[PDB]
Amino acid sequence: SVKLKGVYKRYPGGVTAVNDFNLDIEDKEFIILVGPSGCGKTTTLRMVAGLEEITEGELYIGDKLVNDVAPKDRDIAMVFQNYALYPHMSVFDNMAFGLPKDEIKRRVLEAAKILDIEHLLERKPKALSGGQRQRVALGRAIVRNPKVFLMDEPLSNLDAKLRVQMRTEISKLHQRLQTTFIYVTHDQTEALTMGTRIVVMKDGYIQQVDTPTNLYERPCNMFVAGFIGSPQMNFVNARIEKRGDEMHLLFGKQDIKLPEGKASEYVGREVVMGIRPENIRDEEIYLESMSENVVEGRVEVVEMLGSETLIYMVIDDFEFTARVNPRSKARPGDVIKVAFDANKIHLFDKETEKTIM
Amino acid sequence: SVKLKGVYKRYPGGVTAVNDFNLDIEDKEFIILVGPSGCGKTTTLRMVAGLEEITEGELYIGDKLVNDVAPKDRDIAMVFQNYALYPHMSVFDNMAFGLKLRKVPKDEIKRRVLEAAKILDIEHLLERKPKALSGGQRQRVALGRAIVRNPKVFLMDEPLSNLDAKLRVQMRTEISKLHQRLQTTFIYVTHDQTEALTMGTRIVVMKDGYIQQVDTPTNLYERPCNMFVAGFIGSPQMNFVNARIEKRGDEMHLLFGKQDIKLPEGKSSEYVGREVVMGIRPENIRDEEIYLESMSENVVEGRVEVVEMLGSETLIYMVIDDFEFTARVNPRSKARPGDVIKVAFDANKIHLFDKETEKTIM
């Protein structure tokens, strides 16, 4: 367990890098820190590790306050992008720096075969490059059985398909040792599967802390909504209008009827509507059931992937991206009848940019 | 335009590698040859290129028979795994070769080489040598020696095999953009299936030497002619179970295990009562509550065992009775291992094959 109570970090010149970071990681938890560059996500990790000092706040590991504890005295394994293995040491010895009980150390180190480095086991760092030397750094930390793991983009020099293989082995390791993990990555796509809870940070402030599913389906503001999930969620200005007992959203000359179950102090007001691509669907089941919420749009580019078909269109004056089932019939220039799934509409304040529900 | 009329190739020992290969490529067309290893796809290219002889049949590039024409007199551009760039020549000279001894247009060779370089954004590499380049750049350079040929056909034998995951996709879309630019016939051979759905005008699926099907990407995907095309194109693989067709009233139902799926009015005779193989793709086993209300008749309970969230999709792996099935649904599903899920089978997208003959009934 690690707790950060009201933690600040200020840079030279008074600039605030991390602003009131409060969060309680329970033990045996996988927490992911995502956010744009300079959002303070990397800074907090260096502070939990003890590489930067904590200007203000408290940091506890278990029960012990460690703000002024040297990194070596925290029982933490760290992998950062300065992994920097020693050039004139074998792969084994470069992973065997756990001070120790030799001849069992080897067993655990050979078990690092999970990283597919067993065929490099007696090599030296210069013969590997890019991805392989980063998997060596991982290995070093992998055999440490610490109280918490701290990882800063440890799979960034690897290629797609091998990064995926090592992400599943990190998750299995957390499932096996059940020690706290704090994982930092630029990629968002690796947050949604790995972490128990995800923390979205922006310009030093944490926007939201929730489970991957909850971040995806209940964002707190337009930023989190437009930061998690790709391609970016579609955004339009819309006016809420009550017609009869129905509640409608109007943007351009188009008309979306919200389902009975939505709402008070925003009726007649103009809001921003948010729908994700996979909720603009063209299969005709939806075009008959959600007939009230079908809109005609002029397709401009289509992209077929085998997993999906992404359709980029323009409705009245606004560009929209849609995700439909693989191998679609749409082509650039035609106008297609898309249905907006009102049950998946997000509504934010135009000024505060936070959600109304 | 390229035509291959009844073309065969047999190996030492009498084994036939290519068996009655027939198809007429229209000019300015992108054709893809896909199939398992040793399906003869590489052999066919080697025969179009002139590197192997044609045992029987007729090859016509343009309007002329070229079975006995040397490759170099065939007006062919080739990017194969043979095309090692010349080690001690600049990429420029490596792109100006062939053109340099096909009746040198010295001035008109610089102009064309640099237009092919500007298309591939390799002009800032014109003075580097192949050993200084990396795999991806030399695959762009190798392509470049072919744009300067202005050929009648381009021949590509797995030219994106030496690349890593992301790079591949980047140079495929560049080829699709490239064919859309030169508007010359392309014949492309690749191992990966995913570009059935991405690259080609028409696709040829080959199996054990035979052409299984020649069709457009959508039609290849949506109307496979046999279980092989059905299970070779599309990922994850299409689900297959043995089922028996049964006529109850004028409805027609399909039964496998304890479950019963009713086909819509429009599916007919001379296969009813017999055991068939059913084929449905994962994106047609789907759990959205829209499906369970319209297609309540064809809702099935299945025990989830593994789920994989990808951001683009959610893959759900389930067992029904003794049978296994996979479904592809929206990115963040709530189904988790141990639960039982209520999936709807989209009857309008079920494929039915002969159990013995293994070819499609419709």
Numbering used by the authors:
A (entry chain B): 3 to 101, 107 to 270, 276 to 369
B (entry chain A): 3 to 269, 275 to 369
Manuscript text:
Considering the importance of transporter B as the major cellodextrin transporter, we further identified its cryptic, hitherto unknown ATPase-encoding gene as clo1313_2554, which is located outside the transporter B gene cluster. We therefore suspected that Clo1313_2554 represents the ATPase subunit of transporter B. Therefore, we deleted clo1313_2554 using homologous recombination and obtained the Δ2554 mutant. The Δ2554 mutant lost the ability to grow on cellobiose and Avicel, in a manner similar to that of the ΔtransporterB strain. Therefore, the same phenotypes of the Δ2554 and ΔtransporterB mutants imply that Clo1313_2554 is the missing ATPase subunit of transporter B, which is the sole cellodextrin transporter in C. thermocellum. To better confirm the function of Clo1313_2554, the crystal structure of Clo1313_2554 was determined at 2.8 Å resolution. Clo1313_2554 presents the general α/β-type ATPase domain fold in homodimer form, similar to that of other NBD crystal structures. The ATP-binding Walker A motif from subunit A and the ABC signature motif from subunit B were approximately 30 Å apart in the structure, indicating that the nucleotide-free homodimer was in an open conformation. The crystal structure of the ATPase was solved, showing that it represents a typical nucleotide-binding domain of the ATP-binding cassette (ABC) transporter. The ATPase subunit of transporter B was identified as the encoded product of clo1313_2554, which is located outside the gene cluster of transporter B. Interestingly, this feature is found in many other bacteria.
